Design a protein around this nucleic acid. Structure first.
Ligand SMILES: [Ca+2]
Ligand SMILES: [Ca+2]
Ligand SMILES: [Ca+2]
Ligand SMILES: [Ca+2]
Ligand SMILES: [Ca+2]
Ligand SMILES: [Ca+2]
Ligand SMILES: [Cl-]
Lengths: 329, 328, 330, 329, 80, 329
RNA sequence: UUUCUCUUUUAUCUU
RNA sequence: UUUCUCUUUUAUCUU
RNA sequence: UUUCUCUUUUAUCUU
RNA sequence: UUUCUCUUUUAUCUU
C-alpha cells in the first residue's frame, strides 16, 4: 500500500511526523509541484531545561527559521501579560546562516518554506520530586502589519510588522493535550495553508514590537525579543501554526527534562553561498503524499505523551494504509 | 465521480441565491483541512436613493463590512473629492473589537469563499425611475513607497488600493437594466487557490492618517470612521463588485439590499468563537473545478426575477459541463 | 503523439511561449492553464536591441521579473563584480509608459496585478571573426522582494519599514550551476516560476529606487543599488515569481563585441475595467494538469543556458523531454 | 501520408515554401475552388547587392506584380522618415508583360492572385570585414484610399490610392527574426485572406502618393516611387503581407550578398496576348492542401538563417505528416 | 463532430447576450489563421428620447463608432 | 581492473584528476586510514579574465582554503620583484565559511586537508588578435616562520609566518609546460607529503609579510595581500605544491579567457555550524586508490593544452589499468 | 539523446 | 462519350 | 545485533 | 552521379 508513494513522498511524510533521533536522511524535499533548486535543512535542537518552581513556563514553537523556540516564565496559574517578553533559543549554527547583523539574513538564502516542525519533552526528574502538568494547544499565529499615524514633522503614517493571533496564548485552547508532567509529551505542527508557498527572508527584525514602537500600537498582547543582532533574530515567518506548551511547576517541585526540536525547511540558496553546494531540485509532485499528509495531520492528536512517540511512525503508517484502503472502495 | 457533501454546500453558498436556508457548509473543499470557523454573514438594508444622484455601492472583500457607499451627481463618477463609507455586517464589533488594534483578537486570518449581493426594489412602479449598472473590479491591496522630508530624512511605505481607477467608468463587461428590475450578482476567488490572508491591525482610513491622496495614487478615499464602530480588518482575494444606481431628478428609488458572504476564519484558541470551529473540508477536486467553471459561465449579474431560477441555472451548468467530461 | 494529443490547446501554447523562441511562436498563447479562469490580458513583451559592449569592462545584465522592463544593466571594471558603488539601470520594453503611466503613482491605472509565465533572453553576436573577444557567463538567482525593519532617531523616534531585495548577493559570485562560453557563441536562456503555483502579485506604487529615497544602502542589506530613473520614463511596477537571470559579459580591451539582444515575457495581467486595455482581455485558460506537469519537468530538465546556435534545436529539444517523461507513465 | 494531396496540391505547397533554385516546374496553379484558365508565372530574381556602411538599408518584399522588392537606405539606427523614397527592383521581363506606359498594364493580363512570395539573402562578404545584422518582420500592408477636398473651381473632393499599414515599417515588429549579418536569411509571406481572391490590374500607378498629391494628405509615412513608366510601375497589390528586412551595416563594414526572390502568381490572360498560349485551368480543389497550407504557414518561423533554407522543404514535410498524423486520432 | 474552443466562443460573441462575461474568443474560426488582435467593443449609453420625435438609430459596420443617431418629427422618416 | 578500487577510492581519483564540469558528486572523501567525520567541499571557480598587453600576468594556484588563486601583473619579460603584491580571488561563498573578521575563520571548521587542486584556462580571444604564451611549473611552497629581534622596550624577539620557496616563482622551472596562448591549458597539483595530514585553520592572517613586518625580514621575495578582512584572507596552507602560471601577453595582443578552478577539501566541521549537517565519515582505507593516486600523479605531465582536458579522465584510466596490469606479473 | 548486461553502491518497502 | 492492352513519355511519392 | 526475499531508489563499472 | 520498388501524373502508340 505504501508503495503508491514516491521515494521522496514517503521520506517527506517521515520528516513531517517522525522523530529522526537517528541520523536519518535529513530530507529529500517537498513532493509538491515546485521542482526548482532548494536545500533541505534538518534543524534539530537538544536543550536540557529545568523549570522553576511556582512558575508556569511558556514555550512557543514558532515557525521562525533558525530559532527553535521562545520561552517565558510566569507566576503559576497565570498567563503572559503586557509585562512579558519571550526570548528565542536557536538551533545549532544560527549565525552560520543568517550572519551577525540584522541586515545580513538574506546573505545565504533568500526564501524558505517549512515542511515539518516537531517537538518533544522528555523528563529528567525523579518520581518523588516532580509535580505539575504539561498543557499543549496550537495557535494560528500569522505575521501581519499595523497602520498608525505619528506626530512628527511633517506628520506621517507608520506601518510595521505586528503579530496577529498571539492572544491565543493567553488561555488554554479547547483542543488541547494536558497530562502529568512526568509523562512528557510529543507534538508537531503542519502547513496552515492549502499549499507550500515560499516566504521571503526578513531583514532587520530583532524585536516585535520593533524598536521605537510601543506595544499598545501593535495589538500584540506581549513582546518578542530575539536579543543582540549578533546572536539571534527573526528572519521570517513560516506558514505553520505555532505550538504552545505550558509547563506548570508547583512550589517545591523539581521538574527537569530534555527538549528536542525538529524542522524540515526548504531554502532557496544563493549561488554566492557555499550552502549552495548542497542544493538539489525539489522532489516532483507526489499527489498521494500530499493527500496523505493532509489526512494524517488532521487525524493525529494535538499531542501525545513521550512514550507513544516511538510508536508514532507506526501510528502514522496505519492511518495511511487505513486511508489508502478505505479509498479503494 | 460526484461531489462531496461539503463540496456541494461550498457551491451553494457560492452561487446559491439568498433564500434557500443555504448551509454555510463545512467550508472550502480545498487541500487545506485545518481548524476553521465558518461564518455566513448576511445583511438586510432598507435604503432610499437620492434623486439626481448616482449612488455607488462597493462589495469588497473586507471582513465585517458588507459594502461601501458613496454618492455623486447623476452622470458622474467618484472623484478625489469622494469618500466611501462602510456599512457593517451585524455584530462587527463582537468579531473585531472596538479598537483599531483589536481586530486580531478573535481571529488571526481568513479567506473568502463567496461574496454575493442583491437589490430588491420596493418602489411603486410609476414613482421609480433610473437604472442599475454592475461591473466588477480587480481591486487589490498593495503599498506605496515615497520619501518624506523629516529630520532626519526618511522613506515611507503605506497601504494603497490599486485598481480603484476601474470604478471611474462602466466596465465593458457589465449588467445594465431598469432600476425596478432589481439585480443579483456574485464575486469569486481572483486567485488560482484559496490562500489565507492575515487580519490587519490599525487600518481606519485609506489614504491613512497623515497621507495625502496624492501620495497613494488612489482615485478617491476610503473612510471606515470611528475605530469603535468599524474599520478595515483585511482584504480578501475576491474581485470587488461595483453597483451604480442612477436616480434621475424626481425619482423615488427605494429598495432592499442583501449581502452574502461565506468566510472561513482561523480561530484563536482564546476566542469564544473556537467552540464552533471544525476542520476545513478535505479536497474535492470536482467541486474546485465546478466552482471555476460555473463562475466563468455565469453572467455579471441578473435581474431579481431570474435570481429565483438562478440555482437551477447552476445545476444546469453542472450537468452540461459534467456530461461533456464523462463522455471523453 | 499521445503526449501532444493529451495537452489542451492553450496548454500547448503555454509551453511554447515558455520554452521556445518568439520567432518560432507567433502566438503568445491564451495564458496560464492553471485553476484560475478569471479575466486577464495576455501580453507578450519583446525587446530587440542592437548593443555594443564597452571594451575593457565587464557588463552585468539582469533579466528580472519586473513588468515592462526587459533588463537591468551596469558595467564594472574587468574581472570584478558589482559593489556598493554600483547602480543598475533598466531598459524598457516598448510602450512602458502606455502601460504604467508617467508618474511613480500611476502604475496601477491600467492594470492592478500580474503574473509571469515565461521570461527568456538571447544574445546574438554580430562581430566578425577578427574583432570578437571575451566571455558570456550566466547563472540564476532567487531574488525576491521583501522588507527591512529598522528604528529611526526622528522626533519622536520611529521605526521604518521599506522594500528590500533579498538574495541580491548571489550576483556577486558565479554559482556552480552556470553557463560560460566564448562571447562569439552567444547564448539563450529562460527562467520559470519559482513558486509551486502561479499566484498574482500586486502592482507596486511609487517605487523608483532601491534602496528608496532617503534610505542608505547599508540599512537595506542589498549589496548594490537599483535605479529606474525619471518616474516619467521608467520605474518598478512590481516583482514577479521568477528567478532572476544574471549575465556577465566580459570584454577584453581592444575587443569589438557587438550583438543583438532579445527578451521575451509572457505576462498575464488583471485589467482594470476603465483601461483601454480591457477590450483585449479574455478568460485565463482552464486547468491543464498535463501542461502544468510538463512545464515543471521541462523547466528542471533544461540547462542553465545554451549557445545561440543550438537555440533552434531548443523547441525540438524540449518536445523530446516531454515525450521522454510522458513515456514512463505509460 | 503525403499521398492524400493531389499532384498540384503538393506542387502548390512546394512553390509556397520551397526554394526552387533548381528549374523545378514553375507551378501547376492553386488547388482552390477556382478552375478557370490562368497562367502560372514563376517570378525569380537574382540581385547581387552591396550594403553601404553606416546605413540601415530597408527592403520590402511587397506583393506588387513584376517588382521583386523596394529598398531605401537610412542612417544607421534610424527608420524611414517622410523624407524617404523607396525604389522598386523588377523581376526579369517587367515590360514584357506590363508594357512601357502607365496605361498599358492590363494589356497582357487583367487580374491576378499570388500563391507564394519567398526571399533569401546569401552573404558574399568575408568573415573579417562583415559586421551588423539582418532583422525581419512582416507588415499587413493593404492598398486603400484617402478622401479629401480640394479648393479648385468649382471646389471638389478627391479620392486616391493610399497605402495603409506602412507605419509598421517604422519599428522592429515584436514577432521578428534578428541575427548576425553573415548568417544570411530566408523568409516567405502568405495569403493574408481566408481565400485566394483575384485582384485587378491597376492602370496609371507610378507613385504613391500620386503625382500632384501631397504626402501629408495620404497618411502614408513615406513614399513609393516606381520611376519612369517605361521601366517600372505599380500594377496591383496582392493579398500577401509585406516582408520587411533591415540590414544594418555599421561603419567600415563590408557587407555584400546575393538576394533571391520567388513568386508564384496566377494571372488571368487575355486572348489577344501570346502569353495566353501557356494557359491552363487552375487545379481543382484540394481541401487537404488548403488546410495544410494554413497549418504550415502558421507553424513556420518569421524567418530562418540561410543555411536552414535547404532543409526547409524537409522541415515542411515533417510539419505536414505531423499534422496529418495528429489528426488521425 | 463537435465545435472547437474558439469556434464555440465565436458563436457566443456572435449571438451571446450581453452579460455573460462573453469571451472575445480567439476570433473567427475561418480558414485564415494569420496575426490578428481581437477587440470586444462595448458601449453603455444613457439616453432620453425627445417626445413627438421619431428617433432613428443605426448600427453600422464602422469601426470605433457604435451607432449613428438622427431624429425626425414623429410619423416621418429621414429626409435629405 | 578498475574494480579493485572501492567506490570512494575511484571517486577520490576522479576529483583528483578529473574536471567535474558536470555537477558530478562533489566528493566522497579520502580513502586513507582516517574515518572520522568530515565535510567534502567541492570548490569551483569560473572567472572570466582579460590579460593586459605588454604584461606578463602571474597566477598562483596556492592551496589556501577558499581562495582559488592569486595574481599579479608584471612588465613583459620580467618576473615579480620586491615591488610586487599578489591579490587573492575567492571561490564562491568565502565569507559564508570563514566569516568577516580575521578572527572568525575557525568558527565553521577547525582543520582541513586538500585532496585535489585543478585549474584550466580556456581562451576567449579570436585567432587574429591573440598572441603570446602560457607557461606552467609547480613550486614546493610551504608556510614556515622567521625569527628575528626587535628593538622595543624591553627589547624582544619576534616570530611570524613567512612563506618559504616563493623564490621559485622568479624563474621558469625546468619542468614546465609552455605553449601558444590560444591553446589554453589544464594542470593539477597533488599532496606534497607521504600522507594526508590535517592542517589547522589560521586566525588573523590577512597579509604576508604581516602588518608591521618589513618584507626584508621575512625572506619572501614579494608580497601576499588578501585585502579587507571582511572580504578575503589566509585561513590556512595545505600540503599541495603551488601551481604557477605565466601568461605573457605581447603588445597589442587581445588575450581573454575563462579560468576554472577545482578543489576537493575535507574539513573537520564544528557541531555549532550548520555546515555540520552535511558531515559524513571519511571513506575507509583503499590501499589500491592510494597507490594509484601516487602513480598517476607522478606519470601525468606538468600540464596539457585545454583540448586534451576532456580525454584527461580517459588518459588516467589507461595509466591505472596499465599499472594494475604491469603489476600482475 | 541512441542500448542493454555486470558488479556496483547506497536507499527504502515488505517477511 | 462507348473499351481495354502496349510502349510510351514526362512527373512526383516512397526505400 | 539475530534473517532473508521484494520493489526499491540513487550510484558507478563494463559492452 | 551511386539503386531499385510504389502510386504516381500527364503523354502518345496500338486494338
Ligand atoms: Ca490584540
Ligand atoms: Ca498560493
Ligand atoms: Ca492610481
Ligand atoms: Ca544582504
Ligand atoms: Ca499614417
Ligand atoms: Ca628568500
Ligand atoms: Cl535596434
Amino acid at each position: 500500500a505504501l508503495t503508491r508513494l514516491s521515494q521522496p513522498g514517503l521520506a517527506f511524510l517521515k520528516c513531517a511526523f517522525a522523530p529522526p533521533n537517528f541520523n536519518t536522511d535529513p530530507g529529500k524535499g517537498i513532493p509538491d509541484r515546485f521542482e526548482g533548486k532548494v536545500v533541505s535543512r534538518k534543524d534539530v535542537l537538544n536543550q536540557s531545561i529545568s523549570f522553576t518552581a511556582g512558575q508556569d513556563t511558556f514555550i512557543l514553537i514558532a515557525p521562525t527559521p533558525g530559532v527553535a523556540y521562545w520561552s517565558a516564565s510566569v507566576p503559576a496559574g497565570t498567563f503572559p501579560t503586557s509585562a512579558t517578553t519571550f526570548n528565542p533559543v536557536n538551533y545549532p549554527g544560527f549565525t552560520s546562516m543568517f550572519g551577525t547583523t540584522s541586515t545580513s539574513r538574506s546573505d545565504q538564502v533568500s526564501s524558505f518554506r517549512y515542511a515539518s516542525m516537531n517537538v518533544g519533552i522528555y523528563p529528567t526528574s525523579n518520581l518523588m520530586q516532580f509535580a505539575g502538568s504539561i498543557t499543549v494547544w496550537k495557535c494560528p499565529v500569522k505575521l501581519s502589519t499595523v497602520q498608525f499615524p505619528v506626530a512628527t514633522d511633517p506628520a506621517t503614517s507608520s506601518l510595521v510588522h505586528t503579530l496577529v493571533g498571539l492572544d491565543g496564548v493567553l488561555a488554554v485552547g479547547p483542543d488541547n493535550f494536558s497530562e502529568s508532567f512526568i509523562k512528557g509529551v510529543f507534538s508537531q505542527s503542519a502547513c496552515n495553508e492549502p499549499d507550500f508557498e515560499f516566504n521571503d527572508i526578513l531583514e532587520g527584525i530583532q524585536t516585535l514590537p520593533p524598536a521605537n514602537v510601543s506595544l499598545g500600537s501593535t495589538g500584540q498582547p506581549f513582546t518578542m525579543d530575539s536579543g543582540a543582532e549578533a546572536t539571534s533574530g527573526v528572519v521570517g515567518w513560516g506558514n505553520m501554526d505555532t505550538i504552545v506548551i505550558r509547563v506548570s511547576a508547583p512550589e517545591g517541585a523539581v521538574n527537569s527534562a530534555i527538549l528536542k526540536a525538529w524542522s524540515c525547511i526548504e531554502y532557496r540558496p544563493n549561488p554566492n553561498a557555499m550552502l549552495y553546494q548542497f542544493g538539489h531540485d525539489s522532489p516532483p509532485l507526489d499527489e498521494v503524499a500530499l493527500q496523505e499528509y493532509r489526512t494524517v495531520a488532521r487525524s493525529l492528536p494535538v499531542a501525545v505523551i513521550a512514550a507513544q512517540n516511538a510508536s508514532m511512525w507506526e501510528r502514522v503508517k496505519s492511518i495511511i494504509k487505513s486511508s489508502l484502503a478505505a479509498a479503494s472502495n
